[PDB]
Design a protein around this ligand. Structure first.
Ligand SMILES: CC1(C)Nc2nc(N)[nH]c(=O)c2N=C1C(=O)NCC(=O)NCCS(=O)(=O)C[C@H]1O[C@@H](n2cnc3c(N)ncnc32)[C@H](O)[C@@H]1O
Length: 413
């Protein structure tokens, strides 16, 4: 029995909620995932006088599955999954929700009961459901209305953006470096935020440290400021990216989490000093954390050669990993990062990159790869122009995506 399952969310970490739903389905032995749709963005469809608090942009998709679950049984499952993910199914109708799962279609089945109607009653009135459905089943008609060309119907409905964010194994982390103002204007950091979201960044990495020593106060205030602006723009954003804080200072981590933990997904450490206190902090806030190989080598003669680089990298990260684990932190919440720009010779960086899969395998941690615009990693001349850097970055990005590298950190998508 094939089904299309509609998935929607407009609260919490949106792409994560969707992924959790799909994983929960895929975990069932009596369900087979046939295909996942693209990601679609739309304004909350609301009743005419609903509180503006409910007006938060949606992320929608659908998945096609095969199952031995009969329709009523599958509905029970869907509710069970919404519950576990954290939805309040007695909450007011039309209100925001962490996850929503419905049966959009079941081939040409027509089922009409009070408790369950298939196809879903509103399928042909909702672009955020009909779009992903049509993406998955190209020639599909509502079985009651076989004469109705739903491609034209979808066009009539409009009001839907097909995002460039995807549900792929590899997510793109767009770089928001807050370290070009004019007489009356300083929104370049905002204009670049849009460029990232539009081009498909699933995550954004916000940092105020430069790659000149800057105070805790300055760093924090720069972060705090962008995050206040992010918050003011949240509800209308066509896609709400996961947020990573890019910093090496414990105090900054603490202050910023204390104030904005609700909207932060990940801490991306630039230098894993005081791993013990940081571990305690990651445990307290339950965020993702990225271990980087940055030993703070200041002498170029002492940079890592390639022949022992894999042992040097893994030994160090493993040691930091175990400390995190010993603080109760779930291994699945920890990522590693080679840190190409730190303490490594050119051929070493290139070498660590070529052997990235071996490293992930040995570390048993997911990988964050920061290759963007690094000549050494890209196998390019250091004095290469921005154009040749981004073209080499995109090509490498394609290869890492195919390798199912977990996160790639890039200046542009
Ligand atoms: C809030 C609203 C209208 N706006 C939206 N705007 C955008 N852009 N995107 C959205 O995804 C979106 N979703 C919306 C919305 O309310 N969606 C539906 C929702 O939450 N429903 C929960 C309340 S409920 O149906 O009574 C649940 C109940 O509906 C029943 N039901 C009947 N047919 C069903 C089917 N085919 N699949 C699943 N359940 C079925 C089932 O008994 C369930 O308990």
């Amino acid at each position: 029995m094939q089904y299309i399952i509609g998935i929607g969310t407009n609260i919490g970490f949106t792409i994560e909620n969707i992924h959790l739903a799909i994983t929960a389905l895929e975990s069932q032995q009596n369900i087979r995932i046939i295909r996942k749709a693209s990601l679609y963005s739309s304004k909350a469809v609301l009743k005419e006088d609903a509180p503006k608090e409910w007006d938060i942009r949606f992320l929608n998709t659908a998945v096609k599955i095969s199952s031995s679950l009969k329709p009523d049984e599958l509905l029970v499952l869907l509710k069970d999954i919404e519950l576990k993910i954290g939805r309040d199914l007695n909450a007011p109708a039309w209100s925001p929700r962490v996850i929503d799962l419905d049966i959009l279609a079941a081939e040409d089945l027509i089922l009409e009961t009070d408790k369950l109607t298939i196809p879903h009653k509103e399928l042909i009135n909702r672009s955020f459901a009909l779009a992903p459905l049509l993406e998955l089943s190209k020639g599909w008609h509502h079985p009651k209305y076989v004469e109705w060309d739903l491609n034209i119907r979808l066009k009539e409905l409009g009001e839907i953006v097909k995002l460039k964010q995807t549900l792929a194994n590899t997510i793109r982390m767009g770089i928001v470096n807050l370290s070009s103002d004019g007489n009356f204007d300083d929104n370049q950091r905002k204009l670049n935020l849009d460029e990232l979201i539009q081009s498909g960044a699933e995550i954004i990495d916000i940092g105020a440290e430069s790659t000149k020593p800057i105070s805790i106060e300055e760093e924090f205030n720069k972060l705090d400021e962008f995050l206040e602006y992010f918050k003011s723009q949240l509800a209308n954003l066509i896609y709400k990216p996961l947020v990573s804080i890019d910093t090496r200072k414990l105090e900054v981590m603490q202050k910023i989490l204390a104030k904005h933990h609700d909207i932060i997904w990940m801490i991306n450490d630039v230098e894993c000093n005081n791993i013990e206190q940081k571990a305690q902090l990651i445990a307290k806030y339950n965020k993702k954390y990225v271990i980087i190989h940055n030993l703070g080598i200041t002498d170029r003669n002492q940079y890592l050669d390639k022949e022992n680089a894999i042992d040097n990298v893994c030994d160090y990260i493993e040691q930091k990993k175990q400390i995190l684990l010993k603080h109760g932190i779930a291994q699945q919440n920890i990522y590693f990062d080679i840190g190409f720009g730190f303490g490594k010779k050119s051929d070493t960086a290139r070498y660590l990159l070529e052997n990235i899969i071996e490293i992930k395998r040995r570390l048993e941690l997911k990988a964050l790869v920061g290759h963007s615009r690094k000549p050494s990693v890209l196998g390019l001349a250091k004095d290469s122009n921005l154009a040749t850097l981004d073209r080499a970055t995109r090509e490498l990005s394609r290869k890492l995506e195919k390798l199912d590298i977990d996160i790639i950190r890039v200046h542009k998508i």
